[PDB]
């Protein structure tokens, strides 16, 4: 029996909160990137170091440790980019029109233009960020969404355990909304709005994955073995 299902809503929240990975910095070089090499280099470098934290974060997500190593591997390989992206969007909320990859790295669509097929993804990321902002997404909600992506994205490509743990997180989201004074109707409407954004997050992940693949074939920007293997799992 998994411990996750025995946790209370409040016991689910401060665990996800406490499990949060830190906000990493990019190179301290003050040169605004415009080339693909410089931009993607900074992005992949940051992604590399974030992946290490994401891995130790996932292990802190209730119910995740109760999975087989193989399942844990499959879920991370499937959701890693979705997880990186939703984190990017969350950090970018307070910076309209900007993408805060790192406190010392904010990019706009003008810099995405200098990389074919990148601007479209930026616009999608910016739109998602904007959406998060207008909904006044709360940190407690964000952490719940991120965990849902981890357990959901690869749940099929494989049982009740994950479904039960996902239900548990659903209870926690409603809990947060009720605790925030939302009406019963406002609760299920916001729940729906939040979950529907995951569809768009998945979309951006799949588009980003394709772009990262072609980039791998051009073999200009160096990719870490970890990124390659994570990226590899998507074929």
């Amino acid at each position: 029996n998994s411990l996750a299902l025995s946790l209370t809503a409040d016991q689910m929240v401060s665990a996800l909160l406490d499990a949060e990975p830190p906000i990493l910095y990019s190179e301290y070089d003050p040169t605004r990137p415009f080339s693909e090499a410089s931009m993607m280099g900074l992005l992949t470098n940051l992604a590399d170091r974030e992946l290490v934290h994401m891995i130790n974060w996932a292990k802190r997500v209730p119910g995740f440790v109760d999975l087989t190593l193989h399942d844990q591997v499959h879920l991370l390989e499937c959701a890693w980019l979705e997880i990186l992206m939703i984190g990017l969007v969350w950090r970018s909320m307070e910076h309209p029109g900007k993408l805060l990859f790192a406190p010392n790295l904010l990019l706009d669509r003008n810099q995405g233009k200098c990389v074919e097929g990148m601007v479209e993804i930026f616009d999608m990321l910016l739109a998602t960020s904007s959406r998060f902002r207008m909904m006044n997404l709360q940190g407690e909600e964000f952490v719940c969404l991120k965990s849902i992506i981890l357990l959901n994205s690869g749940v099929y490509t494989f049982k009740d355990h994950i479904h039960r743990v996902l239900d548990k997180i659903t209870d926690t989201l409603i809990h947060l909304m009720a605790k925030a004074g939302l009406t019963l109707q406002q609760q299920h409407q916001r729940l729906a709005q939040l979950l529907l954004i995951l569809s768009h997050i998945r979309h951006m992940s799949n588009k980003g994955m394709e772009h990262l693949y072609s980039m791998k074939c051009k073999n200009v920007v160096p990719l870490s073995d970890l990124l390659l293997e994570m990226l590899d799992a998507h074929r």
């Binding site: 891995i55 292990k59 190593l69 844990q72 591997v73 991370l76 390989e77 073995d225 970890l226 994570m230």
Partner: peptide, 10 residues
């Protein structure tokens, strides 16, 4: 033998 296999252990 994935790097991910190793990192998930430690």
């Amino acid at each position: 033998h994935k790097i991910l296999h190793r990192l998930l252990q430690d």
